[PDB]
Enzyme design. Sequence first.
Site, PDB file in Angstrom:
ATOM      1  N   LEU A  38      -7.756   4.676   0.873  1.00  0.00           N
ATOM      2  CA  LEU A  38      -7.887   4.512   2.321  1.00  0.00           C
ATOM      3  C   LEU A  38      -6.762   5.151   3.135  1.00  0.00           C
ATOM      4  O   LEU A  38      -7.000   5.655   4.238  1.00  0.00           O
ATOM      5  CB  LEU A  38      -7.961   3.016   2.635  1.00  0.00           C
ATOM      6  N   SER A  96      -3.030  -3.751   5.578  1.00  0.00           N
ATOM      7  CA  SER A  96      -1.824  -3.510   6.371  1.00  0.00           C
ATOM      8  C   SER A  96      -1.089  -4.766   6.833  1.00  0.00           C
ATOM      9  O   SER A  96       0.083  -4.951   6.517  1.00  0.00           O
ATOM     10  CB  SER A  96      -2.155  -2.687   7.600  1.00  0.00           C
TER      11      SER A  96
HETATM   12  O1  SAL Z   1      -5.112  -5.396  14.015  1.00  0.00           O
HETATM   13  C1  SAL Z   1      -5.805  -4.391  13.827  1.00  0.00           C
HETATM   14  O2  SAL Z   1      -7.064  -4.359  14.184  1.00  0.00           O
HETATM   15  C2  SAL Z   1      -5.283  -3.175  13.215  1.00  0.00           C
HETATM   16  C3  SAL Z   1      -6.095  -2.051  13.040  1.00  0.00           C
HETATM   17  C4  SAL Z   1      -5.610  -0.906  12.472  1.00  0.00           C
HETATM   18  C5  SAL Z   1      -4.291  -0.855  12.058  1.00  0.00           C
HETATM   19  C6  SAL Z   1      -3.466  -1.947  12.216  1.00  0.00           C
HETATM   20  C7  SAL Z   1      -3.947  -3.113  12.788  1.00  0.00           C
HETATM   21  O3  SAL Z   1      -3.084  -4.151  12.918  1.00  0.00           O
END
Ligand code: SAL
Lengths: 551, 551
Positions: free
Chosen positions: A352, A498
């Site tokens: 990804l 993330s």
């Molecule tokens: O909180 C999100 O929707 C988000 C989306 C893409 C990258 C980091 C993020 O925190």
Amino acid sequence: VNPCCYYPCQHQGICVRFGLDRYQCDCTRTGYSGPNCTIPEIWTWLRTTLRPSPSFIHFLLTHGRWLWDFVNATFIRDTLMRLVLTVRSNLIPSPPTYNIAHDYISWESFSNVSYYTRILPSVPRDCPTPMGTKGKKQLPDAEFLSRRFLLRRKFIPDPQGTNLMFAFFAQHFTHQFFKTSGKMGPGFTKALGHGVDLGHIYGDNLERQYQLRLFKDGKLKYQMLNGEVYPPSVEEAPVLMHYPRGIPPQSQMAVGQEVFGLLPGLMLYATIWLREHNRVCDLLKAEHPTWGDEQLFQTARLILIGETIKIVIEEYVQQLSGYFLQLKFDPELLFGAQFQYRNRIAMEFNQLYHWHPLMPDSFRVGPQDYSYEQFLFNTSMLVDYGVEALVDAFSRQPAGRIGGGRNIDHHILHVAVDVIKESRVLRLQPFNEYRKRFGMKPYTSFQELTGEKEMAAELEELYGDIDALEFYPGLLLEKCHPNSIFGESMIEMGAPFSLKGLLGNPICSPEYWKASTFGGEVGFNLVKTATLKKLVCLNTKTCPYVSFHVP
Amino acid sequence: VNPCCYYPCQHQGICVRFGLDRYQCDCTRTGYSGPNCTIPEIWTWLRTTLRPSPSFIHFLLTHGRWLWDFVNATFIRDTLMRLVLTVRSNLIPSPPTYNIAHDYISWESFSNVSYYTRILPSVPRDCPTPMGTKGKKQLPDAEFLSRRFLLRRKFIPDPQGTNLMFAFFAQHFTHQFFKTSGKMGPGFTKALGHGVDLGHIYGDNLERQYQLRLFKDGKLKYQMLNGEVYPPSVEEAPVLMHYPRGIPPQSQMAVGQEVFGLLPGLMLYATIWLREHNRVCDLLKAEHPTWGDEQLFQTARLILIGETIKIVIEEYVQQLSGYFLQLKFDPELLFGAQFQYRNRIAMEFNQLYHWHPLMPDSFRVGPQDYSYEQFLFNTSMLVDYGVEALVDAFSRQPAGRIGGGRNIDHHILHVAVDVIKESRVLRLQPFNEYRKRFGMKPYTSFQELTGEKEMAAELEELYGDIDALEFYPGLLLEKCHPNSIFGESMIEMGAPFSLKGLLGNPICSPEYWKASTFGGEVGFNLVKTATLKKLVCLNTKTCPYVSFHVP
Ligand SMILES: O=C(O)c1ccccc1O
Ligand code: HEM
Ligand code: HEM
Ligand SMILES: *[C@@H]1O[C@H](CO)[C@@H](O[C@@H]2O[C@H](CO)[C@@H](O)[C@H](O)[C@H]2NC(C)=O)[C@H](O)[C@H]1NC(C)=O
Ligand SMILES: *[C@@H]1O[C@H](CO)[C@@H](O[C@@H]2O[C@H](CO)[C@@H](O)[C@H](O)[C@H]2NC(C)=O)[C@H](O)[C@H]1NC(C)=O
Ligand SMILES: CCCCCCCCO[C@@H]1O[C@H](CO)[C@@H](O)[C@H](O)[C@H]1O
Ligand SMILES: CCCCCCCCO[C@@H]1O[C@H](CO)[C@@H](O)[C@H](O)[C@H]1O
Ligand SMILES: *[C@@H]1O[C@H](CO)[C@@H](O)[C@H](O)[C@H]1NC(C)=O
Ligand SMILES: *[C@@H]1O[C@H](CO)[C@@H](O)[C@H](O)[C@H]1NC(C)=O
Ligand SMILES: *[C@@H]1O[C@H](CO)[C@@H](O)[C@H](O)[C@H]1NC(C)=O
Ligand SMILES: *[C@@H]1O[C@H](CO)[C@@H](O)[C@H](O)[C@H]1NC(C)=O
Ligand SMILES: O=C(O)c1ccccc1O
């Protein structure tokens, strides 16, 4: 035929095989009951019937600047910010589950950290097709697949205004936890930290750290060129680096992330962060005259990890998301939740993050426009130009749209070909399955996936079934959100990986989020108040245009 | 003089030095405010003013069998059981904090797991006395200290009725996480699992596991003697063991815990658990004909870890505590709490678990009464007698009182001398400090610590200040609870270390506590229904008297 090949168990139920044939789905705490975990519980049904479309949510988070500005200024910010955090984090399992070696929980999978974990067990090697039950018996020739749909024809720039400064940041940053083991095979990683340990600065192993260490005031060795600070020479600090044979030690910079040696972009940031760690040491030394090397070193590293996580959430993720809600880094928003402060890198999350389409056609450093042939190993551009200069440049040039298709510059197109191949070795499940696993409904046709009819039609003849469309190609070839750098799945599948990997760091735990951990209110604030701009500008003789957004 | 030597910061505040002199206490989330974290918050004061004496609580938990029996049969059991779990676990920090190397939080302390962690930072090497501010400038000569107060004169048996079966269990069991590195120095451990990974059965490193592995049906290699199953020979499974030079491979049993080789007690249990793992494999194979070696192996290990944690809580800890409340192993009692499913072995917890006084004067195996000289390396007693036999024996002979004083058999008295010395190298803080840290009020005199006037008087001339009485001697020499195997501090300081290290295992997490993790309801129940008796008896041709309590 292996019944689990049919991916029978729904909503995260576990397919367990029994007898020669047979299988049973473990719907423990799934939210559903039934033989395939399909019959919801009242609350579960009620919960999903109201769950507003991810698309809708995105829409809201990107309109009404006016309304949002008010909200960002009320308590409602934290409120949401926390909510995002929790609900997002839940998709990623902790402790970790399976690995390349075990599509089951095993103590060894939980203990052996040289393994990249995965969210979804592999498509069983005894299934009839390479994806399970559907599709062709052979998958599209990656080389071709890559040349037909990922190969850039005309540069499409990213609409969010993401520039090179961000492209390089994202690269350099993600290269501290994505560090696949060469000699160990795919699915093995050399970065045993599995998160933000800032190991690309201090080294991925103790010996290597000690090498880059100065052992004086807690500083990192460095050198002066044009009366400016750059990393030391491989001669000075004899660490292992990757420079094409023929480049001498005296001309190589020792840094922590062996690979970073080839791309002024990387080395640029590596210099800023080194400069930073050294500066923080000086601060600490003021307050703590009584302090020793290690105490200083160790403490500095804790502070930078803090800086890094802040810049990453409030500036980086902000830009990348285009949200109007102002994201916030406050590990206390979690002191109420049941969160586990631990993180392990997912092989899926590595795929990804192969955002190669960000990379431009040519690197313009002012009037000068360099080629990949002049960028790729140029051991002088950095020293030549200087931090400030290159920063300004990268801050001004735009990076390409990530999602969308046919936007990967040919110089690095091979990478994507390899990604496809590697995926298959990992026996990664189908895009549509992951769509489900991360809360989405699967695509019903190639035409729905891509926004068009043309290539959707070819993918169809190629793959044979949307239910056979692979992970990475599916991510890169899906239709982009209105004016976004990519589409739905990238966000819906990437964000959890993330955010869990950001808050699930021991320093965000209530145990370490004490001001004493950082050497006092001083160090603490450094963490609590970091800025991409402060990062560059405090370490440079002159502050240039610095930003993840092109001016 | 280092101000932190005065241990200024109260209730877990953190002493941070500043300037040449100066210091500041970090009372973040301490419950108190002030310069030394002494001024409580309303709730904190109110909370502590009502906190009933640990002694009282103990009293209640040990009387009213009648009343308790009712309670054990109501929901109130779980209720309490959960409460105990939570409130107990809170004293132990997670993530871990400091180590022999850092009296500060450092990424390296959080990452390098070859280190045993500690609850309380060392007494600063710049303090005026070896304990900080009080006491003599030199500490009692351990040899002497050990000969004057820990050396058994007349065997005092433990009143709880703890027999040898328990003594050996406790030994063997604790030797899977207490495994101090010889070549690395004190404060370093070879058991990188830091908990119940059953590594003393499968080996502390992958290679060693593969050695003991049969690679057929998920079984562990073994051998037949008198048509009975025992571990394999070092010849068969060439693993490293510790047998006095002169003992041949063919006469050595390969097992997983190198040391276990010298004491039929250890090898006895090692045989039972091996036998068990092999049996479970057979079960798994029935259900999963389609299963492979690893799948079987890995799954078996998960089940045993389950068995082990159950027997440890419901039978072992029960006995050792003498509580009337029936302890219960149900990882779901925690699914509501904010618990962190991770554990790291404390150097303090290692000291504390040096229960050598359990060991008897002579080992009676029926009419036969063996000496340490006949027990200590006897490579035949096990095979000779047989599992069932030795089990019955150990189940019948009583072990000595742990706390109390002068009850360590001279054959192993050296161990305690070494413990004292080792402590000092670790620069472990004073007993009284730990008293506080674990919720207790410090002793005000040696006469209060010990129940008497005599040796309390000598300790006084020896140490000079109760505020200088060391950790281990303080634990072993404190007055025993009415008819208990030891006193207050042992329980109040040991239980948290114990219960956090038991529930904080990845299998107790809601993620793994799925019946699929164990191969289905089968494996699952094995875990949910384990018994010390079932453990022995299902693996022996005949069931003998088996129990942690002497008949
Ligand atoms: O909180 C999100 O929707 C988000 C989306 C893409 C990258 C980091 C993020 O925190
Ligand atoms: C000049 C630009 C760049 C070049 C030349 C490049 C090239 C590569 C190459 C060759 C690999 C190894 C796999 C293979 O053999 O194909 C790699 C992996 C990867 N790249 Fe890049 N890349 C560039 C920019 C980026 C950027 C901008 C990012 C960040 C989005 C990125 C993310 C990744 C990731 C995460 C991996 C996996 C690393 C691992 O698992 O070890 N790359 N890149
Ligand atoms: C025949 C009986 C026993 C003998 C001969 C014995 C001897 C020893 C020895 C020599 C050591 C090493 C330290 C040194 O050099 O002194 C050791 C450590 C220890 N013993 Fe025992 N012991 C026995 C029974 C027990 C029992 C019953 C327990 C369990 C309560 C126990 C718990 C410990 C612990 C936890 C350690 C520390 C191990 C480490 O950190 O590596 N011992 N024992
Ligand atoms: C982590 O897992 C990998 C794979 O199980 C281990 O690597 C292999 O280990 C076996 C036994 O030592 C060797 O035969 C292989 O050559 C090893 N290398 C690879 C690349 O497979 C690794 O040793 C494990 N690490 C730990 C600490 O358990
Ligand atoms: C864990 O910490 C210990 C101590 O910091 C490390 O052991 C020492 O490491 C240095 C550098 O390799 C050597 O000079 C010493 O000889 C090592 N041994 C000992 C016993 O101190 C150990 O390498 C660390 N392990 C990891 C994985 O970081
Ligand atoms: C303005 C409203 C803000 C709500 C923030 C919630 C954060 C987004 O939450 C996401 O929503 C998706 C769609 O429901 C789900 O599929 C994802 O699992 C979830 O992480
Ligand atoms: C019958 C009442 C059962 C209550 C079970 C609580 C478990 C014991 O709890 C212990 O109590 C001690 C004294 O307050 C504290 O010092 C310890 O920190 C705490 O773990
Ligand atoms: C369960 O899933 C399998 C495979 O998809 C399917 O054949 C079967 O009919 C399903 N059963 C039910 C009750 O949904
Ligand atoms: C390296 O970059 C400099 C500018 O920094 C340029 O003048 C030089 O020609 C480049 N060298 C190569 C081999 O591209
Ligand atoms: C704080 O602790 C130090 C050391 O025990 C003591 O000297 C000082 O008086 C204390 N101050 C207060 C306000 O309690
Ligand atoms: C070993 O124990 C056996 C009984 O199991 C006994 O007959 C023998 O004499 C012992 N050997 C030693 C050296 O003590
Ligand atoms: O709960 C306790 O009080 C306890 C005490 C000693 C040993 C184990 C325990 O669980």
